[PDB]
Amino acid sequence: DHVRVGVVITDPALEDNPIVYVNQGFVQMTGYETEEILGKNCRFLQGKHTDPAEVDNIRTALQNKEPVTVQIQNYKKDGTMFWNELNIDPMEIEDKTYFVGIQNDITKQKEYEKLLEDSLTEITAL
Amino acid sequence: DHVRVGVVITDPALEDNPIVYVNQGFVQMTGYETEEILGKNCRFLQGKHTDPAEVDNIRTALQNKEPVTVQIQNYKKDGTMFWNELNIDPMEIEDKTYFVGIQNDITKQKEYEKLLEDSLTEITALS
């Protein structure tokens, strides 16, 4: 397993703006397989400590078709909390609106960067 | 490196699989603005050290409509080389097929990898 961003595309012309494309990065990041993701709204990543104020801000951004980047607490299938730096970009394909989402697991990024930084320090100590 | 990923969508039903969407991460990474990008084939990112074998891997996957990932040398507008960890997937939107590509600049990681691999060869030679 290596760091990879999640990428989804949703179709807002369909009931509840479901995910119609998801990459393998998202599968690896969240612990859900493609068949458990396609057709669902992305809110299934939310959980106990997801800030409702930021969920509100996302809702408003989507309504207003404004790009938004927000750090939000999300949850893997197995219940593990991760901080998600989420970017959502409204866009158009054949004169219809879609949303592209990019998820960045900053918790994992921090952990992995620490491992490398510590190993490099250990080497110089020799 | 701490930079955003590029995302592009292309329409393979149109001649030469042109870009129909590109994000700001891609604009940032490549040095091209969206008006310079839209309607073009993504091969404009290629140059001297772009390995034909990796271009082959991409071309074959697209022909087969199958996912592909490669690490490929690409070039910014100013001519500087970057290493692109590139993922391309087919996808379906409203009963029509597209490709979605995700570009990850791994230039710095590649620099470290080479130096660490050299160091390992060197320590082993001292064994």
Ligand SMILES: Cc1cc2nc3c(=O)[nH]c(=O)nc-3n(C[C@H](O)[C@H](O)[C@H](O)COP(=O)(O)O)c2cc1C
């Ligand atoms: C493209 C896209 C990607 C999204 N990705 C996430 C995500 O990674 N995590 C999350 O908590 N919400 C994500 N959302 C936000 C939710 O899908 C939803 O819009 C939000 O919870 C507000 O709507 P609601 O009040 O009906 O839940 C995404 C939305 C879109 C359109």
Ligand SMILES: Cc1cc2nc3c(=O)[nH]c(=O)nc-3n(C[C@H](O)[C@H](O)[C@H](O)COP(=O)(O)O)c2cc1C
């Ligand atoms: C969605 C999509 C994204 C692509 N992104 C890149 C890229 O970032 N870098 C690159 O060198 N080629 C990229 N390509 C591959 C080229 O567009 C092209 O398919 C490849 O060079 C093989 O075709 P050719 O031999 O006609 O050039 C992408 C292709 C598609 C469909």
Ligand code: NA
């Ligand atoms: Na070529």
